[PDB]
């Protein structure tokens, strides 16, 4: 039948099971509900989507922990967002987010973020706003790491054009890992639907990204060394991520990934709404921070 | 007589929100294990195997999920709820039937202890069949705690809960040993000016009869609580620095049960199987074949 | 007499005494020779000047420690720089750098950096290159901090124009501290010469900066929250600075403030020279890093 | 008999360059004090007051500048040089005349110890008038150290220096107590395959005569060395976490001398005056008026 034709990019946060890998620390709750310093891990990637201008977001978690994500985040209305929830019964891979979120996505552009990925740096807002406005094809970010063999790895020719993607290569072609933030057009769900599980039994995001690469529709932007991309893969790196955020925040007196703040700066909530969000947290440093935001100009 | 143990793992209010909005503090990790493994380990090192875990209505089921009935670790665990955070002394009313006619010990669910001959420092408090024993520890900010005053001869003469003008820098730690008198003392407590049933009031009751032993926990011991986001990060880094230097874990309950002969080599072997692919299971398997002094 | 008229901006690092403040840790050596993680503190501000394109640099230290700075840094030729040395017998204030360095500066533009100031962030190269190219007036950077009362503080009108500078105000007009990096034109030495000591007995850089402000020649650029400006004011912040750098470097496998690297990327030294600098450090991670730089493209 | 002490604070080569290019590692800070305060404090806690400090030619004058003749702290300090890093056992040749006919103890200038009843753990090694005493400690990477093998009954039967295939995870720490035999044993040592005079060879010489006491330093003690940039940062954070929690310092030599009665309240008062405006002087002044148990 006939369709008609007349900002809308939707977001997805994958906040499912980290299996048994960080057990026993994660036996009683999801990794993405563990705090990084002063706030739940999931505030960080949520803030990343918000900085990209995305207000309609699906959170994918396990059946066991969806209610706790719901208690924490609600339907998003407090922060000028709309948050929806979906469950992932079995951790069958990151590309399953698109099958799980098919109805949520509809006919729109989308972005996927890993619920345990934290980014920090300058003009991040601008770096994200950019990729979001590129409507067709896919956009990813490559970042120089010490251990590229743990990641999807991008190979570049001498001109600096991406020419290949390999998932966890034993002999990486570069030290450039693909980060856990992905922007996609309307082709992604069909590409995902045609994926066959890898030898590990999982539906691989690198296969989605390779599909765009083969079509000549993959933009790979370098996220330079002056950005911090932390993930919380080990107990040791989770501790480092906490110390990192604590050092920045205690130095600056400004928070990284405060959603109330980001919504306020985006004009998604007003001063009066922000004041209401501060009232219940007024006795701790978090509510006090929100209060101070109403009476200060921050450039 | 036998001594039963109680871990109070109740609500920290809104103090660490939003980090703790979703889940209680004592279910969160300190480095590589849930915070509550640490006080549980403290009780186990005092030789206590019958333990009641008290937490909020919402999270008691989740402590139950995490720890089970304890039989996998040669423990006997029971659970109870504290409907509202109305004071630490409520532990003895909530746990009155659990305690029965036995000796007891209470540990706070967010207290972490590290040091040498702990097994021995606890055993000597555990051995007193009469009176109460507590530990005093020199801190920078005594006003946050129950504060003990000593006379010139080193005798404890007063306790004040969160004084505006502390008499010393010696705070009472969150580990308490009691005789058969504590339930009856807790039953006669009146709420304090802050609307709480105070553990310090209990301790003062023993002090007034000359039945409070106040042992000094020396500077060569580490007492950490997880009261702020900053100190929480400090506790994790501390445990990480010790464990990665030594190749030995602090407060691994499976290891402690095994060393106490509460489980045998074959039970530990079974416990190691689920986490065989990660560091924790690998650690437990290694405990089967290594002599550690 | 008649003068004639036909990149040349010179740099100065103040690396003098921190008094007794960090004693006893600084009894046996200068604070600016203490390592921050894996390299001496002074590598960081030196790298900052290098990133600004400055190759001619004066290091001001105490008589006691100048030889150790000389042993460490030499005359700069190894790194495509020229380094000169001057002593500050008594810690009489930061603005004394211009009287001490008067002959070094000559008729040129200049930049002053504090030897204990560390900066990290994206397009820092570009942010510095910018200020260096502004030839007339002065350029400074303002950064939101938790404790502005410890610093020179800048006040802005509602339009965002700087209107006042106050040195360590008990009641700061904003949370914007002036950072320890300063770019000056040819007027600075005369302004410094006319300074009278403050009540603390010191020649204040904020008085120099106010002089430019009163003339309408002070540019104050915001260094945003996605940049890290760390100083090493306390034992606690020195520890945090070390952990910060260690987390970035171990994540990325790239160093912050490696002068050999920066000189190589600036074309001030070639591959063969870099190879020679790596030979003596070949057994440790530092020399190994320098070696890897010859065989890798880093964007 | 009296026991003299030696701190070996010599060169770490190019291993931590460029951090240590300008100055030796043991002059750098661990948190708030120079690294060498920590082993000095260890000797002082073992009751040792006559101490020889051995370092590189370049930096001995700077240890002399930092520490003086020790009389301000009720110590008797002397200095000597190790012209080249030719093995720890060189300490006893360099210090032969210093030692004379007395008992001795050697500590490495970059070893940091923390734990309870250290004063007591050292005093019991200090009391042996015959033989040698060392401490073994469970580590993750024993191949970096002198490694001790035990039989089934817990007896030390072998030592290997940096084995490719360690017999256990028990490393010998950098603190050694010796009787009058050590100089003569060191004098007969031959350089090892690595061109070093080995402390492990000295220790094996005592072991062969059944005169090596190998005490276990338990897991409740922290032994830190500052061998890598990473571990250096871990040592500082560890000391910071303890000191800021307790309001008490680890390895403050002025305090240790005062508690040992080597200086009096009036001497400490004078020592506090120079740094009165910072935390360290404020700490020392506070020690005059506070009972710390
Ligand atoms: C640099 C870290 N990112 C970040 C930024 N940039 N901002 C400023 C900002 C948010 C949204 C719209 C305009 C400005 C925050 O408030 N919180 C943040 O966490
Ligand atoms: C280092 C803190 N304490 C501790 C000790 N001491 N032990 C040894 C031990 C446990 C039970 C019976 C005998 C010996 C552990 O296994 N785990 C520990 O956490
Ligand atoms: C982001 C931290 N700054 C930094 C940067 N940007 N670079 C890249 C660079 C240096 C000079 C010219 C072009 C590129 C380093 O090599 N070391 C650094 O420390
Ligand atoms: C915590 C490590 N040990 C330590 C101890 N034990 N003491 C107490 C003490 C010193 C000398 C004689 C009697 C008592 C310190 O003053 N500083 C210390 O660093
Ligand atoms: Cl920014
Ligand atoms: Cl002690
Ligand atoms: Cl960058
Ligand atoms: Cl122990």
Short mmCIF file of N, CA and C in Angstrom, two decimals, chain A residues 20-30 33-35 37-40 43 64-65 68-69 71-72 235-236 238-239 242-244 246 250 280-281 283-286, chain B residues 14-24 27-29 31-34 37 58-59 62 65-66 229-230 232-234 236-238 240 244 274-275 277-280:
data_model
loop_
_atom_site.label_atom_id
_atom_site.label_comp_id
_atom_site.label_asym_id
_atom_site.label_seq_id
_atom_site.Cartn_x
_atom_site.Cartn_y
_atom_site.Cartn_z
N UNK A 20 27.90 -14.88 34.24
CA UNK A 20 28.52 -15.17 35.53
C UNK A 20 29.88 -14.48 35.70
N UNK A 21 30.26 -13.65 34.74
CA UNK A 21 31.63 -13.15 34.62
C UNK A 21 32.13 -12.33 35.83
N UNK A 22 31.27 -11.49 36.40
CA UNK A 22 31.64 -10.67 37.56
C UNK A 22 31.01 -11.21 38.84
N UNK A 23 30.49 -12.44 38.80
CA UNK A 23 30.04 -13.11 40.00
C UNK A 23 31.25 -13.34 40.86
N UNK A 24 31.11 -13.19 42.20
CA UNK A 24 29.84 -13.07 42.91
C UNK A 24 29.31 -11.64 43.15
N UNK A 25 30.06 -10.61 42.77
CA UNK A 25 29.67 -9.20 42.93
C UNK A 25 28.37 -8.84 42.21
N UNK A 26 28.06 -9.55 41.13
CA UNK A 26 26.84 -9.32 40.37
C UNK A 26 25.77 -10.40 40.56
N UNK A 27 25.89 -11.22 41.60
CA UNK A 27 24.85 -12.23 41.90
C UNK A 27 23.53 -11.60 42.35
N UNK A 28 23.62 -10.51 43.09
CA UNK A 28 22.42 -9.90 43.66
C UNK A 28 21.83 -8.76 42.81
N UNK A 29 22.58 -8.23 41.84
CA UNK A 29 22.04 -7.23 40.90
C UNK A 29 22.85 -7.11 39.63
N UNK A 30 22.19 -6.55 38.62
CA UNK A 30 22.77 -6.28 37.33
C UNK A 30 23.96 -5.33 37.41
N UNK A 33 23.27 -1.67 37.14
CA UNK A 33 22.77 -0.98 38.32
C UNK A 33 23.85 -0.73 39.38
N UNK A 34 25.06 -1.27 39.20
CA UNK A 34 26.19 -0.96 40.11
C UNK A 34 26.57 0.53 39.99
N UNK A 35 26.84 1.19 41.11
CA UNK A 35 27.24 2.57 40.95
C UNK A 35 28.65 2.70 40.39
N UNK A 37 31.07 5.46 41.10
CA UNK A 37 31.17 6.55 42.07
C UNK A 37 29.80 6.83 42.70
N UNK A 38 29.08 7.83 42.22
CA UNK A 38 27.92 8.37 42.94
C UNK A 38 26.58 8.13 42.26
N UNK A 39 26.56 7.40 41.15
CA UNK A 39 25.30 7.18 40.45
C UNK A 39 25.33 5.82 39.76
N UNK A 40 24.16 5.23 39.51
CA UNK A 40 24.12 3.95 38.81
C UNK A 40 24.82 4.00 37.46
N UNK A 43 23.13 5.52 34.32
CA UNK A 43 23.06 6.96 34.10
C UNK A 43 24.05 7.44 33.03
N UNK A 64 14.55 -10.49 35.55
CA UNK A 64 14.81 -10.35 36.98
C UNK A 64 14.99 -8.88 37.38
N UNK A 65 15.72 -8.11 36.58
CA UNK A 65 16.08 -6.75 36.99
C UNK A 65 15.31 -5.60 36.35
N UNK A 68 13.71 -3.12 38.87
CA UNK A 68 14.64 -2.20 39.53
C UNK A 68 15.05 -1.04 38.61
N UNK A 69 15.19 -1.30 37.30
CA UNK A 69 15.46 -0.23 36.33
C UNK A 69 14.26 0.70 36.23
N UNK A 71 12.04 1.20 38.72
CA UNK A 71 11.98 1.97 39.97
C UNK A 71 12.93 3.16 39.91
N UNK A 72 14.12 2.92 39.36
CA UNK A 72 15.14 3.95 39.22
C UNK A 72 14.77 5.04 38.23
N UNK A 235 36.47 -6.07 37.63
CA UNK A 235 36.40 -5.38 38.92
C UNK A 235 37.43 -4.29 38.98
N UNK A 236 38.61 -4.54 38.42
CA UNK A 236 39.65 -3.52 38.42
C UNK A 236 39.29 -2.28 37.60
N UNK A 238 36.24 -1.29 36.76
CA UNK A 238 35.09 -0.68 37.44
C UNK A 238 35.60 0.25 38.57
N UNK A 239 36.60 -0.21 39.32
CA UNK A 239 37.19 0.65 40.35
C UNK A 239 37.86 1.89 39.74
N UNK A 242 35.22 4.45 38.67
CA UNK A 242 34.77 5.21 39.84
C UNK A 242 35.74 6.30 40.29
N UNK A 243 37.03 5.97 40.35
CA UNK A 243 38.05 6.92 40.79
C UNK A 243 38.17 8.08 39.79
N UNK A 244 38.05 7.75 38.51
CA UNK A 244 38.12 8.72 37.41
C UNK A 244 37.03 9.77 37.54
N UNK A 246 35.18 10.35 40.18
CA UNK A 246 35.31 11.07 41.47
C UNK A 246 36.36 12.21 41.40
N UNK A 250 34.99 16.02 41.93
CA UNK A 250 35.49 16.71 43.11
C UNK A 250 36.44 17.88 42.77
N UNK A 280 13.32 16.06 47.10
CA UNK A 280 13.47 14.77 47.80
C UNK A 280 14.91 14.35 48.10
N UNK A 281 15.86 14.83 47.30
CA UNK A 281 17.28 14.54 47.51
C UNK A 281 18.00 15.68 48.25
N UNK A 283 18.75 16.61 51.22
CA UNK A 283 19.68 16.38 52.34
C UNK A 283 21.05 15.85 51.92
N UNK A 284 21.17 15.31 50.70
CA UNK A 284 22.46 14.81 50.22
C UNK A 284 23.06 15.73 49.15
N UNK A 285 24.32 15.46 48.82
CA UNK A 285 25.07 16.25 47.84
C UNK A 285 24.45 16.26 46.46
N UNK A 286 23.71 15.21 46.11
CA UNK A 286 23.10 15.13 44.79
C UNK A 286 21.97 16.17 44.65
N UNK B 14 18.26 8.08 52.33
CA UNK B 14 18.50 8.66 51.02
C UNK B 14 19.94 9.16 50.92
N UNK B 15 20.77 8.78 51.88
CA UNK B 15 22.10 9.38 52.05
C UNK B 15 23.03 9.16 50.84
N UNK B 16 22.99 7.97 50.24
CA UNK B 16 23.82 7.67 49.06
C UNK B 16 23.01 7.62 47.75
N UNK B 17 21.80 8.17 47.75
CA UNK B 17 20.99 8.21 46.53
C UNK B 17 21.63 9.16 45.55
N UNK B 18 21.55 8.86 44.25
CA UNK B 18 20.81 7.78 43.60
C UNK B 18 21.56 6.46 43.44
N UNK B 19 22.79 6.35 43.94
CA UNK B 19 23.55 5.09 43.81
C UNK B 19 22.78 3.93 44.43
N UNK B 20 22.15 4.18 45.57
CA UNK B 20 21.45 3.14 46.32
C UNK B 20 19.92 3.20 46.17
N UNK B 21 19.42 3.98 45.21
CA UNK B 21 17.97 4.06 44.99
C UNK B 21 17.42 2.69 44.61
N UNK B 22 18.09 2.03 43.67
CA UNK B 22 17.64 0.73 43.14
C UNK B 22 17.77 -0.42 44.13
N UNK B 23 18.82 -0.39 44.96
CA UNK B 23 19.18 -1.54 45.79
C UNK B 23 19.98 -1.11 47.03
N UNK B 24 19.86 -1.88 48.10
CA UNK B 24 20.49 -1.51 49.36
C UNK B 24 22.01 -1.58 49.24
N UNK B 27 24.20 -4.90 49.46
CA UNK B 27 24.19 -5.81 48.29
C UNK B 27 25.16 -5.36 47.20
N UNK B 28 25.70 -4.15 47.33
CA UNK B 28 26.65 -3.63 46.37
C UNK B 28 28.03 -4.21 46.63
N UNK B 29 28.89 -4.22 45.60
CA UNK B 29 30.24 -4.77 45.78
C UNK B 29 31.26 -3.84 46.42
N UNK B 31 34.97 -3.99 45.77
CA UNK B 31 35.84 -4.63 44.80
C UNK B 31 35.18 -5.83 44.10
N UNK B 32 35.35 -7.04 44.63
CA UNK B 32 35.00 -8.25 43.87
C UNK B 32 33.89 -9.09 44.48
N UNK B 33 33.35 -8.66 45.62
CA UNK B 33 32.32 -9.42 46.29
C UNK B 33 31.31 -8.47 46.95
N UNK B 34 30.09 -8.96 47.17
CA UNK B 34 29.05 -8.16 47.79
C UNK B 34 29.47 -7.72 49.17
N UNK B 37 29.39 -10.05 52.30
CA UNK B 37 30.39 -11.10 52.52
C UNK B 37 31.39 -10.70 53.60
N UNK B 58 11.99 -4.78 51.37
CA UNK B 58 12.23 -4.95 49.95
C UNK B 58 13.40 -5.88 49.64
N UNK B 59 14.47 -5.80 50.42
CA UNK B 59 15.70 -6.47 50.04
C UNK B 59 16.00 -7.79 50.77
N UNK B 62 16.14 -10.69 48.62
CA UNK B 62 17.31 -10.70 47.75
C UNK B 62 18.58 -11.13 48.49
N UNK B 65 18.00 -14.82 48.36
CA UNK B 65 18.42 -15.32 47.05
C UNK B 65 19.94 -15.48 46.99
N UNK B 66 20.67 -14.46 47.46
CA UNK B 66 22.12 -14.48 47.40
C UNK B 66 22.73 -15.58 48.27
N UNK B 229 30.28 7.96 49.28
CA UNK B 229 30.74 7.47 47.98
C UNK B 229 32.25 7.42 47.97
N UNK B 230 32.89 8.43 48.56
CA UNK B 230 34.36 8.49 48.59
C UNK B 230 34.97 7.33 49.37
N UNK B 232 33.63 4.49 50.10
CA UNK B 232 33.26 3.27 49.37
C UNK B 232 34.31 2.90 48.32
N UNK B 233 34.73 3.91 47.57
CA UNK B 233 35.80 3.77 46.58
C UNK B 233 37.13 3.44 47.25
N UNK B 234 37.35 4.03 48.41
CA UNK B 234 38.58 3.75 49.18
C UNK B 234 38.59 2.30 49.69
N UNK B 236 37.14 -0.34 48.28
CA UNK B 236 37.37 -1.22 47.11
C UNK B 236 38.82 -1.26 46.66
N UNK B 237 39.45 -0.09 46.60
CA UNK B 237 40.85 0.05 46.24
C UNK B 237 41.78 -0.62 47.26
N UNK B 238 41.39 -0.54 48.53
CA UNK B 238 42.14 -1.15 49.62
C UNK B 238 42.13 -2.69 49.49
N UNK B 240 41.35 -4.42 46.77
CA UNK B 240 42.02 -4.71 45.50
C UNK B 240 43.55 -4.73 45.64
N UNK B 244 45.49 -8.31 45.16
CA UNK B 244 46.33 -8.43 43.97
C UNK B 244 47.82 -8.56 44.31
N UNK B 274 30.62 -23.73 39.53
CA UNK B 274 29.82 -22.71 38.84
C UNK B 274 30.62 -21.53 38.29
N UNK B 275 31.64 -21.09 39.03
CA UNK B 275 32.42 -19.94 38.63
C UNK B 275 33.81 -20.32 38.12
N UNK B 277 35.04 -20.59 35.29
CA UNK B 277 35.53 -19.76 34.19
C UNK B 277 36.00 -18.36 34.62
N UNK B 278 35.73 -17.96 35.87
CA UNK B 278 36.23 -16.65 36.33
C UNK B 278 37.19 -16.77 37.50
N UNK B 279 37.69 -15.62 37.96
CA UNK B 279 38.73 -15.58 38.97
C UNK B 279 38.34 -16.17 40.30
N UNK B 280 37.06 -16.04 40.65
CA UNK B 280 36.60 -16.45 41.96
C UNK B 280 36.56 -17.98 42.06
#
